Amino acid sequence: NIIIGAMTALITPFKNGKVDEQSYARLIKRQIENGIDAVVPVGTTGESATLTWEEHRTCIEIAVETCKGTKVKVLAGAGSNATHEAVGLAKFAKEHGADGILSVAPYYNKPTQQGLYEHYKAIAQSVDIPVLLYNVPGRTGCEISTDTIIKLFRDCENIYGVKEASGNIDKCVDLLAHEPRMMLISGEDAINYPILSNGGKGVISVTSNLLPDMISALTHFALDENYKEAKKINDELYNINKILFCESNPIPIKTAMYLAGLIESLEFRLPLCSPSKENFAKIEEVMKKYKIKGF
Amino acid sequence: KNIIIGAMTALITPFKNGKVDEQSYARLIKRQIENGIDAVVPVGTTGESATLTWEEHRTCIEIAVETCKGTKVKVLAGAGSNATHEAVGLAKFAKEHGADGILSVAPYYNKPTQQGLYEHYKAIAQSVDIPVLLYNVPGRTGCEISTDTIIKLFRDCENIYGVKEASGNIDKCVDLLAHEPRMMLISGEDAINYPILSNGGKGVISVTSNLLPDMISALTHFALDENYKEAKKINDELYNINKILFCESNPIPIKTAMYLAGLIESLEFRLPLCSPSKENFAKIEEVMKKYKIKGF
Ligand SMILES: N[C@@H](CCCC[NH3+])C(=O)O
Numbered sequence: 378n379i380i381i382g383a384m385t386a387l388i389t390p391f392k393n394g395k396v397d398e399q400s401y402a403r404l405i406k407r408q409i410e411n412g413i414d415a416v417v418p419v420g421t422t423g424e425s426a427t428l429t430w431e432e433h434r435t436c437i438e439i440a441v442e443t444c445k446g447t448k449v450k451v452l453a454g455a456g457s458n459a460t461h462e463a464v465g466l467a468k469f470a471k472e473h474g475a476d477g478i479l480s481v482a483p484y485y486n487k488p489t490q491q492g493l494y495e496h497y498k499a500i501a502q503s504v505d506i507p508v509l510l511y512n513v514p515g516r517t518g519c520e521i522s523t524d525t526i527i528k529l530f531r532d533c534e535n536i537y538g539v540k541e542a543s544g545n546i547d548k549c550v551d552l553l554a555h556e557p558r559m560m561l562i563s564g565e566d567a568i569n570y571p572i573l574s575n576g577g578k579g580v581i582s583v584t585s586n587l588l589p590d591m592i593s594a595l596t597h598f599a600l601d602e603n604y605k606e607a608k609k610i611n612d613e614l615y616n617i618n619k620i621l622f623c624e625s626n627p628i629p630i631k632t633a634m635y636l637a638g639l640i641e642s643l644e645f646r647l648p649l650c651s652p653s654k655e656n657f658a659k660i661e662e663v664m665k666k667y668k669i670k671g672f
Numbered sequence: 673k674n675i676i677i678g679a680m681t682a683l684i685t686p687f688k689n690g691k692v693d694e695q696s697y698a699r700l701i702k703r704q705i706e707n708g709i710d711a712v713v714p715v716g717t718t719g720e721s722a723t724l725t726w727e728e729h730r731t732c733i734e735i736a737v738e739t740c741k742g743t744k745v746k747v748l749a750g751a752g753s754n755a756t757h758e759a760v761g762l763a764k765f766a767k768e769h770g771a772d773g774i775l776s777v778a779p780y781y782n783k784p785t786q787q788g789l790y791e792h793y794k795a796i797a798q799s800v801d802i803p804v805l806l807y808n809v810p811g812r813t814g815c816e817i818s819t820d821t822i823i824k825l826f827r828d829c830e831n832i833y834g835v836k837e838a839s840g841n842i843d844k845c846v847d848l849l850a851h852e853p854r855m856m857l858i859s860g861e862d863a864i865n866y867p868i869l870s871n872g873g874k875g876v877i878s879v880t881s882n883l884l885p886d887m888i889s890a891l892t893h894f895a896l897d898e899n900y901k902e903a904k905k906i907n908d909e910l911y912n913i914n915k916i917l918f919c920e921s922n923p924i925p926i927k928t929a930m931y932l933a934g935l936i937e938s939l940e941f942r943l944p945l946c947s948p949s950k951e952n953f954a955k956i957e958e959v960m961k962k963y964k965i966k967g968f
């Protein structure tokens with residue numbers, strides 16, 4: 378009982394300080410129409426930290442209602458540095474039609490490996506839908522060790538894999554060599570193919586917000602072991618994959634979506650803000666080299 | 673500039689049956705007041721601010737301002753958040769409820785840019801009229817408030833008067849005070865309290881002061897009196913306990929020490945925080961033996 382394939386960490390477009398819910402549904406439809414397998418509402422790319430609870434819940438509802446009749450699954454962003462908050466988000470996502478949940482490792486409080494095990498066990502025991510771990514130590518300040526990830530996969534029936542955003546291909550080999558039954562998901566666009574070629578079964582992408590057809594083609598070429606095609610797209614996408622992180626995600630990707638005319642206003646919620654005027658031109662310069670799909 | 677300096681304690685938040693033990697909390701603050709502590713920091717990183725509800729976060733601030741009232745011990749209320757609107761709400765509550773100042777941690781997880789950090793703290797400083805002390809701890813937040821950003825906020829905002837550094841970078845400490853000697857650098861790292869104070873730091877926000885407030889206060893006050901021989905001596909004596917209090921993630925070791933010292937009733941954390949390992953439980957207990965722990 379898995380959620381795999383090409384997935385998009387959806388941005389959360391704002392307009393006049395409010396979630397633009399019409400653009401939000403429209404962007405998800407654009408993902409559905411270009412071969413995306415799942416959408417991740419209210420992730421790191423979705424500015425989950427500055428959204429209220431009612432906005433976090435609304436973006437989940439818009440994702441589930443848009444994907445009805447489609448196979449874009451909804452891996453609802455339900456992570457938190459407080460276990461009771463993460464259990465509450467997991468319980469909401471289940472009761473409102475989400476196919477699974479993405480649960481980021483607790484940030485700022487830096488739990489121990491024992492605490493991470495108990496944190497995700499409480500989340501996994503509160504629902505009966507798949508739970509995908511999310512490891513990003515550069516943002517959280519903590520690391521879910523390989524041993525902890527493997528234990529959670531084997532002890533909790535709904536925990537089926539991990540979204541790795543650590544730039545450590547050695548750990549990816551370590552995970553699948555010792556536990557080949559888990560679903561390793563790439564959370565780093567620049568190394569999507571190396572993660573997929575070693576046995577990864579999907580991506581949760583930032584670049585797919587701008588180029589969903591290319592991320593989708595890459596992931597599915599890799600899943601069919603057509604590595605000559607999968608690597609080609611991964612190499613061609615490297616420049617945009619790196620320039621989308623010249624500043625902290627999701628500042629560059631939202632700037633690109635605005636430059637592509639896909640969102641109406643380049644609005645962030647503080648402490649996030651607009652990029653520099655130099656980076657504004659660099660992102661626009663890199664975008665001119667790629668085929669950006671419309672609506 | 674209105675300042676809050678000296679020896680300060682990042683108060684732990686004791687729980688009992690899943691609720692904040694408020695009688696124990698006010699008793700811990702009195703013990704801090706009675707051992708020469710100049711200010712208390714409610715609901716910091718040590719106070720498990722991430723797992724406290726909004727009502728519990730507000731309650732601990734209220735208890736701190738009430739326990740310290742009638743004394744010169746100030747309340748530097750923890751009011752940080754990775755959401756600017758959340759941090760502004762916390763700053764406004766602390767103001768309207770008697771806090772002398774606020775401690776505002778750098779936004780975690782979302783990693784704001786240097787421009788975003790400036791606008792974040794500018795909005796906080798303009799929302800309140802009490803002193804604002806920045807809090808830099810890159811190992812926990814994933815971002816760093818650069819020296820240039822800290823100095824800009826200090827010079828552009830009336831209420832921004834310094835920073836709590838928890839970065840293990842004494843080079844940065846020299847950088848701050850060499851270019852802006854009027855700021856109040858506060859040590860957020862117990863093991864290097866004296867080196868920060870000897871270069872011009874004006875106080876500490878301590879984890880070890882929960883267990884040994886008399887020693888942290890004496891250390892800070894020796895340094896402020898330029899008695900660097902006695903300040904370093906205590907800093908050296910405290911090195912073993914200062915490091916064992918971080919053998920696991922704060923506040924797991926300090927709460928274990930407070931429990932082992934009989935200062936709190938139950939060794940209760942709120943998930944994802946939990947009790948330390950068996951070996952670390954013994955290591956903390958062994959290091960505690962070499963120190964005189966004050967009672968109530
Ligand atoms: N500052 C809080 C807000 C959570 C709102 C719901 N995602 C956090 O990032 O954990």
Ligand SMILES: N[C@@H](CCCC[NH3+])C(=O)O
Nearest residue numbers: 459721722723724725729
């Ligand atoms: N867990 C969230 C919400 C905290 C709310 C105030 N205690 C955070 O760390 O920001």
